[PDB]
Structure 1
Amino acid sequence: EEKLPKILIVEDDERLARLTQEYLIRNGLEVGVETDGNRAIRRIISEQPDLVVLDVMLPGADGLTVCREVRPHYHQPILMLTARTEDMDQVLGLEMGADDYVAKPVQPRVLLARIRALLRRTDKT
């Protein structure tokens, strides 16, 4: 056995989510994919991933609603990764409980480094 950090990607662009998933798996992470916001809420709470990569514009429940609903029962890092790149969007996402806010398109190594920085802070806490 070998327990890797568990990542959940929440992203409704299915191909994009999969390409991101494959990259992160090649870099020492165990990664699942969820494409619906309401499914993501229940899955985050029950599966308790070590970190969530969270899209904002989602069917069922947008990323801000996801944060509101999971944060009472889920305390691990949330990294928002979204095409909603305006300053107000970033402030709102962070104020709603996201620990990082990353603009699409993100360079794969940057996304990986930002994930690792959040996991490091948690593990050192």
Structure 2
Amino acid sequence: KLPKILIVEDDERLARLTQEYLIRNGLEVGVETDGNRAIRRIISEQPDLVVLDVMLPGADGLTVCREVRPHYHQPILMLTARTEDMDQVLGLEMGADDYVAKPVQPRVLLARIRALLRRT
């Protein structure tokens, strides 16, 4: 009965390294690399939390938020290299509960994931 995390990240190698670390810290973690696939997968699998990049093939992160939010109310943590002020404000306003700059220290990501899961 571990918390289920879905990592949505185009960088396959980065996604996996992040996945392995979170798994080592009491989380069950899956990885999706396509934005359109993420929308379908998030709605059907209903992860406890989504770690979401803004830049994605198929559908970008902002579009992923808009499309899943009517059917998915769990925390979404945006994790991206798109770190300008406008980008951050826009992500949050579109439905992300957090917006984190890459590269993120593993422990910091874990702490933010835990804090979000705490308020559900």
Instruction: Give the TM-score taking structure 1 as reference length.
Output: 0.95
User: How far off is 1:119 after superposition?
Assistant: 0.2
What is the CA deviation profile of residues 1-45 of structure 1, one whole-angstrom value per residue up to 9, with x for unaligned ones?
xx1000000000000000000000000000000000000000000
Identity in percent: 100
Instruction: Give the TM-score taking structure 2 as reference length.
Output: 0.99
Q: Which structure 2 residues correspond to residues 53-92 of structure 1 after superposition, within 5 A?
A: 53-92=51-90
Tell me the matched-pair count.
120
- Please list every run of 5 or more consecutive structure 2 residues that lacks an aligned counterpart in the other structure: none
Looking at structure 2, the residues matched to 10 and 105 of structure 1 have their Cα atoms a distance apart, in angstroms, of 15
Q: Which structure 2 residues correspond to residues 1-125 of structure 1 after superposition, within 5 A?
A: 3-121=1-119, 125=120
User: How far off is 1:52 after superposition?
Assistant: 0.1
What is the CA deviation profile of residues 48-78 of structure 1, one whole-angstrom value per residue up to 9, with x for unaligned ones?
0000000110000000000000000000000
User: How far off is 1:89 after superposition?
Assistant: 0.2
Query: Stretches of 4+ moved more than 4 A in 1?
Result: none
* RMSD (Å) for aligned C-alpha atoms: 0.5
